[PDB]
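Example 4.3 (complexes with small molecules)
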Amino acid sequence: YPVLWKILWGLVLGAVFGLIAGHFGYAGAVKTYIKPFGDLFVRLLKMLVMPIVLASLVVGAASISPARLGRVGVKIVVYYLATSAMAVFFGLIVGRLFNVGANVNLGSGTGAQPPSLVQTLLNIVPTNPFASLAKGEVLPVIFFAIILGIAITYLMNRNEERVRKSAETLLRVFDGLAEAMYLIVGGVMQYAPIGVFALIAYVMAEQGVRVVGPLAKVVGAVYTGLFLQIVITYFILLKVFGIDPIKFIRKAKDAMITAFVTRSSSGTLPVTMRVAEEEMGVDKGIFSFTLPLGATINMDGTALYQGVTVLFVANAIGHPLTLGQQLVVVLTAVLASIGTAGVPGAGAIMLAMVLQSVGLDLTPGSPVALAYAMILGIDAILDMGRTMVNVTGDLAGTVIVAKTEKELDESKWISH
Amino acid sequence: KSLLRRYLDYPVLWKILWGLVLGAVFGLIAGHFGYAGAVKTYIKPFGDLFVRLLKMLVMPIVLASLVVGAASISPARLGRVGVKIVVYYLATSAMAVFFGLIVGRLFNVGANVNLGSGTGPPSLVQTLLNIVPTNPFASLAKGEVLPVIFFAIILGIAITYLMNRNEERVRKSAETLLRVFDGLAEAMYLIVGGVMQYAPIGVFALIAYVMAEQGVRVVGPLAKVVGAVYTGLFLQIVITYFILLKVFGIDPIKFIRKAKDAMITAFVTRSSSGTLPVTMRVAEEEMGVDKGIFSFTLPLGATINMDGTALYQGVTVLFVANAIGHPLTLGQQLVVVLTAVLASIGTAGVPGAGAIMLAMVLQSVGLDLTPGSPVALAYAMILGIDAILDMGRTMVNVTGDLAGTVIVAKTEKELDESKWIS
Amino acid sequence: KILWGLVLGAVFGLIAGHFGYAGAVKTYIKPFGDLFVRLLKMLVMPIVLASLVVGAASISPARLGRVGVKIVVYYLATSAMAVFFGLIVGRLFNVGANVNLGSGTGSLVQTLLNIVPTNPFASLAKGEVLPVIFFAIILGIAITYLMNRNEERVRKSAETLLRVFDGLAEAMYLIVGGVMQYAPIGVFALIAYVMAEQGVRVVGPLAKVVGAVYTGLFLQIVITYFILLKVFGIDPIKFIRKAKDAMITAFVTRSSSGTLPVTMRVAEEEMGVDKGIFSFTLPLGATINMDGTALYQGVTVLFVANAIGHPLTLGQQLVVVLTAVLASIGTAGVPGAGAIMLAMVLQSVGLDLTPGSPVALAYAMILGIDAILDMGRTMVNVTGDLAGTVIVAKTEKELDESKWIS
Ligand SMILES: CCCCCCCCCCO[C@@H]1O[C@H](CO)[C@@H](O[C@H]2O[C@H](CO)[C@@H](O)[C@H](O)[C@H]2O)[C@H](O)[C@H]1O
Ligand SMILES: N[C@H](CC(=O)O)C(=O)O
Ligand SMILES: N[C@H](CC(=O)O)C(=O)O
Ligand SMILES: N[C@H](CC(=O)O)C(=O)O
Ligand code: NA
Ligand code: NA
Ligand code: NA
Ligand code: NA
Ligand code: NA
Ligand code: NA
Ligand code: NA
Ligand code: NA
Ligand code: NA
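Answer. The structure with D-aspartic acid bound is encoded below.
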């Protein structure tokens, strides 16, 4: 059965299974007897994340010039900010069509300390990479791996045979590791149809029943807005750089479906990278840098979930956001999506920062704190679709930057 | 550059047996004569150094040997080796509880404690998922062996795949990586050998401290617990291990003389995981087993195959249940076999975890450790002599790991018969 | 240029702390010093592990063993001299005699065993240098043994492994040099922040402590280091000129362990020591060889007892020499840890830090200027590591005599 089209079978069936079990009251059998298999699928991808990030980027940063890496960053970051900003802008319009939370009708009454930005930045530079590796801190690994692979290529270009042979040997240890990791990613993706089925079956069972109210109308709204981001911003950007966007989606889909049901960008980095190499044809000089960075700081789906649910609260308490306030949201939902860790649920946690920025404080027991908790009740329903666009923008950004740097192997894009 | 240097000249297997016998005589003297606090202060640190040294080697020598060994074998074999070692571990655990129950009733442990007592899916799955690590750098830093065993097996297998490629580039990268582990494994096994120079001293100290602290306590019905447990541990070795060993054509007397360094070390460190470096170096040099086997069976067995604990748990549960005037019926002892096997599989390879898990074995037959009850009193009588019993069991926990590794090896033709001829 | 940022930042921070903009300096200049510290920090664990595995293979145990026996004997004697200087310099300045406070008239072994790691992957993640030092020696010693095997097969495995450490060390030393491009800025920021916050406080008998502590630190360099250096035939003006990057990085980061990458690259590029030496003596000395701490402790211990009217007797000052040496060995190589350990030196002559007591006030006067004293302290903590590594290296002929000629 076509493995491009079989992981898609597990997604649908688990969704029907979980919706059916959820609508019929067996979600506790699904948590006990089905949830563990998706958890196994999650643990397997998780173990690959730290080595496959470290090794691919040491290799990739050696296997390219600094000035390219530097131009890749400036390019990928210019793309990343603007695709995030467009996501906020799309959620705001999609939130109004669906008219989210206007019928929740809570009275509220007429109404900062922004987190230090510098310490988050200094936090990029690790102070012990063995610790950042053991703690799982991807962004500090990205920094050390680039710094390291850059130094390895410098040492490969030295007059000594003794120095060249030591540095070149080190780089082979990383190349040996990276090639081994991409191998297992492909092997675990044999189980991927099952883990997908279990995760979506557990999720649909627990919060299926909850997608029935104006929360259901929220879900309708968030998924619609995510879609526009793809078919408008990604397809147009993809088609703009001469990439058949249908060939792009057809290649991304393994990374999209694991992103969806694991609700973790960082947890689906291995599939996103293996998709970026085998299917997409990107060179490690590119995706070994952009794909892990984007798993953290490029969350188009979160920046749009945050845009849609922020309108839901202000409507739900009778203090709708003015225009001048929605323009603060574009700034601050981008900032919060940059800050959102790539693990399940962290986007809701960061949504608070976005409210605190427009003057909707979450004082406990207040009407605002009530609307926030209506959202967190369907968070997994919205979490799946959110992480998917967080990854898809990482691939569309990697593929687009690659065709710009001549680092895209066009032999992989031929319907024959 | 010191003043004095004279040690290190004797058969280390014979001198490690010298430190064990002498330390037991020494600690017993401080016990009945009251210098047990000098031994904890002035002798225990040497046994502690010997433990830290073996401890530093565990994570590299498991990771490297199993990456090496797992690349150096075919998966369809590895899967059959696992199936073989796993069925052996279960049957021998079941056999140990079966022996502890029989040896426990023969010695009749705790039948005369005379405490009055009033006549009055969910949990295992996460333990399995937890075998799969979610970050191996962390599982390494945290010391999580079973997650590393998993990663190491999974890794080396991928390395052999890459060594078989049309590319000269992929083959040589994998081939290079594989050398780093092989380089690491050989360096670890080297240091194991250097450290085992200190082992006659470290063995002497550990047994001297334990015998000093808990010697005095082995005088009462706890002494009869000791009598039962050692008798069963002895029976488990000379009956089930010897009969099992001889059935597959291994001289059981040759096994013990090769195992002894691991046996004596497991005994005095009371930690399977802590005697793994000696257990593997013994599996290679003395036993003649190939890294394709013991790099998997020896770390897997240090955790999940505890024959010595599974017999300890059978004897002490009979001791407690007899001690409250509600002796165990047969139908319960068949639950003890079911549940002490389960609880011995769960017992971590650290000193004392068998008592901590012994509680789970009691909870399974209806002896709750509610505070102030008679039951909690008998459990604490056991925890009072746990070290005296901890030594003898970890010896049989490890002795059974070597016996299982060698027996599985000869069925896969992977044992070097040149060490067994003379 | 690292020496210009040090001068300019100190003049700058003194001015800002004098217009009350020390919180403007903490807000807008301290981060550059923190980047420079995080950058140097990331390198310590790899560049220590790799350099010592390499260096320990590339030398004989009996040398390493004799180097150790030599470096440890050097380490003790130079430390003991510092306290004797702090006692003399603290007594010369008569520190804290005008504080006039009335006072009432009437596990070590585990730290040793702690050197032996129990999981080296963990000791790596934790930043525990000394347990890595032990494992790296134990490892690298094993590699040459396997490279000195009859096998072609094992010779190539270990030779492969050793190259991984050599490849890593060479990248580490490379990055240290690149990070030192930023160092003129990071130095400026750190000294500007410290001068801003604690400048104002060098004004009282605290000023005389700063005067006293720095004066003795200088003698340790210009007397004991220079005399010992000249005794083994090393030009001290060429030495300091080579040491300076490690000195000034140690000065403004107040972390010996944080200056390890600069101290080692100075030991290789500038000094010319072989990894068989400095990859063992320099990380060992960052922890246990603190001349600068032992002199602070001698001067400030005199400061407390004078400030409370129970001056130390001779028999007591001779306990300070023993115990300020011991406390400097125990002081971690991070900012401030010498002050924390000064407490153990006070308790050693009977100045207990019972809360609210007169003793506890003099301690807190000292902790108010700790950073002003911490900078000068960590500088002589590494400066003594370089001087001894070079001196011990020349005794094992492992010093490159070509870098000391023009
Ligand atoms: C006890 C026996 C009960 C039998 C079933 C009765 C339960 C109520 C209807 C069930 O159908 C679901 O419930 C919501 C009904 O409101 C829909 O919400 C929503 O569904 C979309 C989003 O999923 C939104 O766009 C829609 O506006 C909104 O109707 C939802 O989709 C639909 O699947
Ligand atoms: N699901 C997480 C966080 C979120 O849901 O916002 C991610 O993008 O990786
Ligand atoms: N001694 C422990 C378990 C126990 O205490 O029984 C071991 O085998 O590692
Ligand atoms: N500054 C620290 C400790 C101290 O202040 O003494 C060091 O030298 O490493
Ligand atoms: Na974006
Ligand atoms: Na992303
Ligand atoms: Na983010
Ligand atoms: Na068993
Ligand atoms: Na065992
Ligand atoms: Na166990
Ligand atoms: Na010294
Ligand atoms: Na020092
Ligand atoms: Na110290």
